[PDB]
């Protein structure tokens, strides 16, 4: 026995806040959190405690420390089957990563609709508010490999596998409502342009390089999702604080056979929130696993990620009533024109047990639909339907990937398909063909019907010649980028301009910069002029005179496109750093900690070393991390209680902690003599908005701090931060 | 034509300094740089200019922008074979990454020995100083995935494939002279402990987590290579500025059949140099491709990486004469006991054309030896011989991986092996077996001899019973860690203390930190106490009484184990940041650039925006990057010329650039009114060693800067940097 005698090696099987206990496999951390998919995985879950170590053939091993040799300093023998099995399995652990969205973090949960949607769709999982559907959800970046960093600037994937009673439905979406390109035939061109360049394989997890902006400058259909990536949408604070979208128009089909067009949304119940660039980029260094870690720890704390599914619904007769084509995936449907109707709630409430087996091997594919749904002719969706089945043949080793446990349906599946690599199911049917008489034709086809019927495609009329031709209705590139720009707050616009300026600064061929600036001049001249100034480029007279693109169906803004214009802050699950000193005023710390706990806000006690410090009254304070070990990047706010401020006041790390939090627009609260830190951040005696300060942490100090946290960041500080050397 | 009329899309095919031209495929950047292996890849090199776009079957494509559909807003048709081929190939682009050392950067070059080694080895590639052997070299980290960052704390790989006239020899080494474990049977346990933990797949690129330190604490054989890893050897400045080692004792076999034991070394001719931890960790966020980039750009500039191959030779009769076992890969052979004999020079002088084809698919394996070399019974090397062939069957898709162009021998290869997936060679031999009469027994075995003979193993005597047992001679774990600690300078010892402190502070289970501090107390009580203080652990009386391990064969230190104890600086290929203002004093800039060019040191001109600025004499200066875009982390030294200093005197990013460089111990030079920046970094009027200052930048000013850069960093500043908040 090598475990400590006090049992401190094993995390408690109860919800605990981030950092309080080591993290564990979900079934050991939360054994009573159950759903029908999690229970169905029990046939393959493997324990370990009290069992003998064996080969994969069940032979007990006596010595797992040594190879078999001829003498204890002699050569290794070929007859060592125990060594060779163990090193063979090791040698073949890796499988190909996903071509795109290779970097991702996943969790188990459940979905329930708010009311039956039987009037608009016959989909069984939406038919009854008491029908619970298990889900598995994977969030991801796009460009980087599986070992790249989480808080890069990039689009994020948001993929949900619903294990329904009539089939698996995968809703495979991203966190922006459009994509970069119009037709799937260009997807390898676009992805090869954003990915690391082919001669040297640089840069990882970044679009800030010549080939991406060469392609963008030559393909103005990309400019709308480029706008979203350059905004703070491209750097979410967490997977819990971003929107999701299916992007394409799909169809709902009800039992009377009526089709309604639909676009799918997920609303984050934790609100929308993003990092600022300098913080995101620094965080890819200090904690490249920050979003993976944050998701896992929220679930362990009981801060479950929750999202509301909603639908934009357009009747078939209104297909042509907009200035843009509903089938064009570079266009959004403004919520001012078609509101999102709330449909039901998804809660993610359990981590996987093994990341490879459940996350790495999961396969999502937007062609996995169920009766009550159907596709449209969007030409990006149409090509996606080919790709996701094809790519699993190499990634997951063959055509039996639906037998890997995470991908298995929970409902029945039976057919005439046989064999393939890795075949698990042993069919007993005398027949492997239909029609057959030798098994009375079972399993049998099922007519379409209101419930539990066979799939049938909506009989949409097709009329046209066979052409490789883009619809002229798709040939408008600039009005949606402009609607996006005008919908952002002034600070969000500043952040967009800085995103394009930073990215084009890394493009080495200056002509590519110039061509991008020309495209910006076709969107909005204030944007193009501001990015041009940062690049030292002067707009020509012709550029200054480009006429702005039209409004989108009369709109000159839509606030639902902004992260922040409409307040939706939620503090639960956020975290605050508390900078300790060697003799902390304990009454300050009591007040701080209990106010935080009352609103579900976590704290991390930090100091210049690990171990403990003792407060004014003898209270022993356990230290979570050092200043340098858990930097202000990883927290939402900073609080300094009073005490012996001289302990830390000349500590460079403590001072820089506050400078960094201040640059990144985070709320900071200073009690008592911690107000001496006002000189480090240049705060005036009569103080400034976004800095909370009092003689003590009582009265309204914690309410004021918590108000600031619900507004996320102190945007009014932006003009104050440029002077600051941090 | 989409290219600019001025030709500015295409980099000049001549050596250029980093940032002067876009980077390019090696055969286009340096078409006149040749060696026999680079020529031999001409059969598979494919151009592009003036050729038509086709399918893989050679059919010209007319419209590569659209899928085929029934009408221009209609559904995609299954008969679109051009779309499906293009998307199928995309779908199957990825192959499994290497199980370890997945992150690596490679180059072509050549090697030649200084004199014939035929008295000690019959190996053909060491027989003639004028016979050149092409090589391909891959440098790597160990733990992280292929999209992880370069400047992590980790061991580095250094693998060289020599394309000899008598076969491929692969010397597959690392940058420290021992490994973590003794027997290959434990490699999957150690690798699993250092890799991301299996429930959640965190952390990437980092050993600072509970499982790694759990295994270390329970396996004291690991402590010697852990010490190197926690030292600044864990964070090299460049792959050009680290040592390489084959780690194991091998054998050299001469023409008379005599065996000499040998350990292989590479000496960097650019000298030994490493980052400091705060710089290295921030660089993984600001440029996760820093080492891959710096290697490619050194080769494009003509700053070719050069290494000296060296042998430690031990006669067979001296196998047992040290106080450690020569076959134990956790023991090094001190150079004070057995010197490194210089054997030859390797120069890397061309970058690949396609990273996937040449770097990703390259396969190195230490069992690829040639006549005149042989193995020993080192129990770690013996298990490696199984693994590297086995792992390529899945990674590279089958047993014909030697037919992948990068891996092909340049010498003849012929045998009776046939078939396997993606077989390229079409054999015309009537026989596929030997002995045969039908082809007069060709190809034929060849007797061993002095040159061009068949391979025969050295007839080592084997005596012992079939045991799984560790040699008792391997059971000593603390004397080499101690020798290494005592051989470091005082600043290097402080950085090792900081490396263990930072890592163990991230271990959540406190008893594991305690266990590791108890192991440290068995190596050196000063090290153990300094780590313990940072963790708030107090040594017990028993720990304070642990008797220090014995010296290694009487050695108290060996300065060849330190990076810096013996000066070996070389400034050629290093890079300085020059911080511009909008009216640069052109006389300073002239002087600076002339002195840098004389020593082969590059410069990058930086400002607060991109574009150009004009100096006092009218000279237009193009800007490489902004102060934030190319931080002080990416350079060796910072120079600020005079001019209109009020332009940048209050710029936050320029002042921070100097604070960050100062903190990281880099030389800083301030001319004229740029001396106003002394206030930001708190330098007294009288000045300080490591800050160069004068009225103008002249001969003397630059000589002093260049002398500082030859000593790499300003170690004497270390007590001054804790004050500064950066
Ligand atoms: C024609 C090819 C194609 C195109 C046009 C797209 N994808 Fe895709 N996508 C792939 C081909 C692909 C893929 C090669 O099939 C992947 C990689 C590995 C896998 O299983 O599927 C994939 C993976 C992938 C994943 C990760 C699924 C997971 O976590 O495993 C997400 C979230 C998306 N995609 C989302 C999108 C959205 C919202 C798109 C446009 C609206 C889109 N993809 C277009
Ligand atoms: C002994 C110290 C060791 C050193 C210095 C060493 C060095 C290396 C290096 C440098 C590479 C990367 C080669 C490249 O650039 O592609 C590598 C790959 C590998 N190593 Fe070793 N290694 C060591 C021990 C081992 C051991 C003991 C095993 C198994 C017992 C092992 C199994 C592998 C495998 C499976 C790969 C991937 C190779 C491929 O996919 O082509 N390593 N190691």
User: Is residue B561 helix, strand or coil?
Assistant: helix
Largest CA distance in chain B: 92
In the reported structure, the alpha carbon of residue A183 is separated from the centroid of ligand 1 by a whole-number distance in angstroms of 14
Largest CA distance in chain A: 92
Min distance B365 CA to chain A CA atoms (Å) = 13
Pairing label, strands B157-164, B167-174: antiparallel
Answer for the pair A218, A190: CB distance below 8 angstroms, yes or no.
Answer: no
User: Is residue B593 helix, strand or coil?
Assistant: helix
* Residue B538 in contact with partner chain A when CB distance is under 8 A: no
Answer for the pair B515, B222: CB distance below 8 angstroms, yes or no.
Answer: no
Angle between helices B210-218 and B187-194 (to 10 degrees): 140
Radius of gyration of the CA atoms of chain A, in A: 28
* Rounded CA separation B147/A284 (Å): 12
* Rounded CA separation A197/A163 (Å): 39
Domains annotated for chain A, with CATH where assigned, are 24-409 (2.40.180.10), 469-572 (1.20.1370.20), 573-726 (3.40.50.880)
Of B63, B355, B652, the CB nearest to A725: B652
CA distances to A131, A141, A583, B210 from A339, in Å: 26, 28, 56, 49
Query: Per the CB < 8 Å rule, is B22 touching A502?
Result: no
* Rounded CA separation A127/B132 (Å): 75
- DSSP class of residue B79 equals T
Give the distance from CA A335 to its chain's centroid. Answer: 22
User: Is residue A478 helix, strand or coil?
Assistant: coil
Which has the closest alpha carbon to A363: A47, A86, A106? A106
Which has the closest alpha carbon to A499: A698, A216, A101? A216
State the closest ligand 1 atom to the C-alpha of A181, by its place in the atom list counted from 1: 5
Query: Which ligand sits nearest to residue A329's alpha carbon?
Result: 1
Output helix, strand, coil percentages for chain A, rounded to the nearest 5: 30, 15, 50
For residue A193, cis peptide bond before it (omega within 30 degrees of 0): no
User: Is residue B363 helix, strand or coil?
Assistant: coil
- DSSP class of residue B359 equals I
In the reported structure, the alpha carbon of residue A297 is separated from the centroid of ligand 2 by a whole-number distance in angstroms of 34
Which has the closest alpha carbon to B406: B169, B163, B167, B173? B163
Query: Per the CB < 8 Å rule, is A147 touching B103?
Result: yes
Contacts B72 to A, Cβ<8 Å = 464, 467, 469-472
Instruction: Name the β-bridge partners of B668.
Output: B638, B691
Contact map slice: B 224-263 vs A, CB within 8 A: none
Output helix, strand, coil percentages for chain B, rounded to the nearest 5: 30, 15, 50
In chain A, whose CA is at the least distance from the CA of B8? A509
Query: Per the CB < 8 Å rule, is A185 touching B103?
Result: no
User: Residue whose CA is closest, atom 29 of ligand 1?
Assistant: A138
Which has the closest alpha carbon to A535: B609, B638, B46? B609
* Rounded CA separation B101/A714 (Å): 43
Which has the closest alpha carbon to B262: B276, B248, B273, B281? B248
For ligand 2, whether the C-beta of B548 sits within 6 Å is: no
In the reported structure, the alpha carbon of residue B257 is separated from the centroid of ligand 2 by a whole-number distance in angstroms of 30
Query: Per the CB < 8 Å rule, is A76 touching B286?
Result: no
Instruction: Name the β-bridge partners of B637.
Output: B576
Main-chain phi, psi angles of A354, to 5 degrees:
-135, 120
User: Is residue A39 helix, strand or coil?
Assistant: helix
In the reported structure, the alpha carbon of residue A99 is separated from the centroid of ligand 1 by a whole-number distance in angstroms of 8
Answer for the pair B477, B220: CB distance below 8 angstroms, yes or no.
Answer: yes
User: In sequence order, which residues have a C-beta less than 8 Å from that of residue B16 and are 6 or more positions away?
Assistant: B300, B301
CA distances to A658, A665, A721 from A716, in Å: 17, 9, 10
Answer for the pair A124, B121: CB distance below 8 angstroms, yes or no.
Answer: no
Contacts B537 to A, Cβ<8 Å = 611
* Rounded CA separation A333/A318 (Å): 13
User: Is residue A97 helix, strand or coil?
Assistant: coil
Contact map slice: B 406-465 vs A, CB within 8 A: 462-465
Helix H or strand E encompassing B263:
strand B259-268
CA distances to A47, A190, A223, A502 from A230, in Å: 46, 17, 10, 10
User: In sequence order, which residues have a C-beta less than 8 Å from that of residue A280 and are 6 or more positions away?
Assistant: A151, A152, A153, A235
Which has the closest alpha carbon to B564: B232, B277, B291? B232
Query: Which ligand sits nearest to residue A244's alpha carbon?
Result: 1
DSSP string for B326-348? TT-TT----TTTSPEEEEEEEEE
For residue A214, cis peptide bond before it (omega within 30 degrees of 0): no
CB atoms within 10 A of CB B2: 8
Which has the closest alpha carbon to A506: A473, A534, A470, A474? A534
Contacts B500 to A, Cβ<8 Å = none
Which has the closest alpha carbon to A485: A182, A226, A281? A226
In the reported structure, the alpha carbon of residue B398 is separated from the centroid of ligand 2 by a whole-number distance in angstroms of 19
* Rounded CA separation A553/A551 (Å): 6
DSSP string for B180-213? S-SSGGGHHHHHHHHSPPTTT---TT---SHHHH
Is A495 among the catalytic positions?
no
Main-chain phi, psi angles of A167, to 5 degrees:
130, 165
Helix H or strand E encompassing A721:
helix A718-721
Contacts B723 to A, Cβ<8 Å = 650, 652
Give the distance from CA A538 to its chain's centroid. Answer: 38
* Rounded CA separation A250/A385 (Å): 13
In total, chain B counts a number of residues equal to 726
Give pairs for B394-400: CB < 8 Å, separation 24+. B394/A91, B394/A92, B394/A94, B394/B96, B395/A94, B395/B95, B395/B96, B395/B98, B395/B363, B396/B95, B396/B361, B396/B363, B397/B95, B397/B421, B397/B422, B398/B422, B400/B424
User: Residue whose CA is closest, atom 41 of ligand 2?
Assistant: B363
CB atoms within 10 A of CB A649: 16
Instruction: Name the β-bridge partners of A371.
Output: A373
**E-assigned strand segments in A560-673:** 575-579, 602-607, 612-614, 620-622, 625-626, 637-640, 668-671
User: Is residue A162 helix, strand or coil?
Assistant: strand
For ligand 2, whether the C-beta of B222 sits within 6 Å is: no
Is A101 among the catalytic positions?
yes
Helix H or strand E encompassing B160:
strand B157-164
* Rounded CA separation B433/A501 (Å): 66
Contacts A24 to B, Cβ<8 Å = 199
Answer for the pair A511, A467: CB distance below 8 angstroms, yes or no.
Answer: no
CA distances to A83, A133, B270, B316, B381 from A69, in Å: 11, 56, 42, 21, 13
* Rounded CA separation A432/A426 (Å): 12
Helices (H) and strands (E) in chain A, counts: 19, 20
Query: Per the CB < 8 Å rule, is B22 touching A508?
Result: yes
Q: Could you tell me the sign of the dihedral formed by the alpha carbons of B640, B646, B649, B652, in that order? A: negative
Query: Per the CB < 8 Å rule, is A65 touching B185?
Result: yes
For residue B435, cis peptide bond before it (omega within 30 degrees of 0): yes
Contact map slice: B 59-98 vs A, CB within 8 A: 62-77, 80, 82-84, 86-98
* Rounded CA separation B725/A450 (Å): 68
Pairing label, strands A602-607, A575-579: parallel
Query: Per the CB < 8 Å rule, is A288 touching B509?
Result: no
């Amino acid at each position: 026995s090598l475990a400590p005698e006090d049992g401190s090696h094993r995390p408690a099987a109860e919800p605990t806040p981030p950092g309080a206990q080591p993290t564990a496999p979900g079934s050991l951390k939360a054994p009573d959190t159950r759903n029908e998919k999690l229970n169905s995985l029990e046939d393959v879950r493997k324990g370990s405690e009290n069992y003998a170590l064996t080969t994969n053939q069940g032979v007990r091993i006596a010595d797992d420390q040594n190879s078999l040799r001829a003498g204890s300093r002699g050569p290794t023998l070929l007859e060592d089957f125990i060594l060779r099995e163990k090193i063979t399995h090791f040698d073949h652990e890796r499988i190909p990563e996903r071509i795109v969205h290779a970097r991702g973090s996943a969790a188990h949960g459940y979905f329930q609709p708010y009311k039956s949607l039987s009037d608009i769709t016959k989909a069984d999982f939406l038919s009854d508010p008491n029908k619970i559907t298990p889900v598995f959800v994977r969030f991801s970046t796009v460009q980087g490999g599986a070992g790249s960093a989480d808080t890069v600037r990039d689009i994020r994937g948001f993929a949900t596998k619903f294990y329904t009673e009539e089939g698996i439905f995968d809703l495979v979406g991203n966190n922006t409502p459009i994509f970069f390109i119009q037709d799937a035939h260009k997807f390898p061109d676009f992805v090869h342009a954003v990915k690391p360049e082919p001669h040297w394989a640089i840069p990882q997890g970044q679009s800030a390089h010549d080939t991406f902006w060469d392609y963008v400058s030559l393909q103005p259909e990309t400019l709308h999702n480029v706008m979203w990536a350059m905004s703070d949408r491209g750097i979410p604070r967490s997977y819990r604080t971003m929107e999701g979208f299916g992007i394409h128009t799909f169809r709902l089909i009800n039992a009377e056979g009526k089709a309604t067009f639909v676009r799918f949304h997920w609303k984050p119940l934790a609100g929308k929130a993003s990092l600022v660039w300098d913080e995101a980029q620094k965080l890819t260094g200090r904690d490249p696993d920050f979003h993976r870690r944050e998701l896992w720890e929220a679930i362990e704390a009981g801060d479950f990620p929750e999202y509301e599914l909603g639908f934009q619904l357009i009747p078939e007769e209104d297909e042509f009533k907009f200035d843009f084509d509903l089938l064009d995936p570079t266009k959004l449907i403004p919520e001012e024109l078609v509101p999102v109707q709330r449909v039901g709630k998804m809660v993610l409430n359990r981590n996987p047990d093994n990341f490879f087996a459940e996350n790495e091997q999961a396969a999502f594919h937007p062609g996995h639909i169920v009766p009550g749904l159907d596709f449209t002719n969007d030409p990006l969706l149409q090509g996606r339907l080919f790709s996701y089945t094809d790519t699993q043949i190499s990634r997951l080793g063959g055509p039996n990937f639906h037998e890997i446990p995470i991908n298995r349906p929970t409902c029945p599946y039976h057919n005439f398909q046989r064999d393939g690599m890795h075949r698990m199911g042993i069919d007993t049917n005398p027949a492997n063909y239909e029609p057959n008489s030798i098994n009375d034709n079972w399993p049998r086809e099922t007519p379409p019907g209101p419930k539990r019927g066979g799939f049938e495609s909506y009989q949409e009329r097709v009329e046209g010649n066979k052409v490789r031709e883009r619809s002229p209705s798709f040939g408008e590139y600039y009005s949606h980028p402009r609607l996006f720009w005008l919908s952002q707050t002034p600070f969000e616009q500043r952040h967009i301009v800085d995103g394009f300026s930073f990215q084009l600064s890394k493009v080495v061929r200056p002509y590519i910069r110039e061509r991008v600036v020309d495209q910006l001049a076709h969107i909005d001249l204030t944007l193009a002029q501001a990015v041009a100034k940062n690049l030292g480029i002067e707009l020509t007279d012709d550029q200054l005179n480009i006429t702005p693109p039209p409004d989108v169906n009369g709109l000159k803004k839509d606030p639902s496109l902004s992260l922040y214009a409409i307040p939706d802050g939620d503090v639960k699950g956020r975290v605050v750093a508390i900078l300790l000193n060697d003799e902390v005023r304990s009454a300050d710390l009591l007040a701080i900690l209990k106010a935080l706990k009352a609103k579900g806000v976590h704290a991390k006690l930090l100091y210049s070393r690990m171990g403990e410090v003792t407060a004014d009254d003898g209270t022993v304070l356990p230290i979570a991390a050092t200043f340098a070990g858990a930097p202000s990047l990883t927290v939402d706010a900073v609080i300094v209680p009073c005490g012996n401020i001289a302990d830390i006041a000349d500590n460079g790390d403590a001072n820089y902690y506050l400078m960094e939090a201040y640059k990144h627009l985070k709320p900071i609260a200073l009690a008592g003599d911690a107000r001496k830190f006002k000189a480090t951040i240049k705060i005036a005696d009569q103080g400034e908005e976004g800095i909370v300060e009092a003689d003590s942490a009582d009265g309204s100090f914690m309410d004021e701090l918590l108000t600031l946290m619900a507004a996320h960041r102190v945007w009014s500080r932006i003009p104050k931060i440029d002077k600051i050397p941090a």
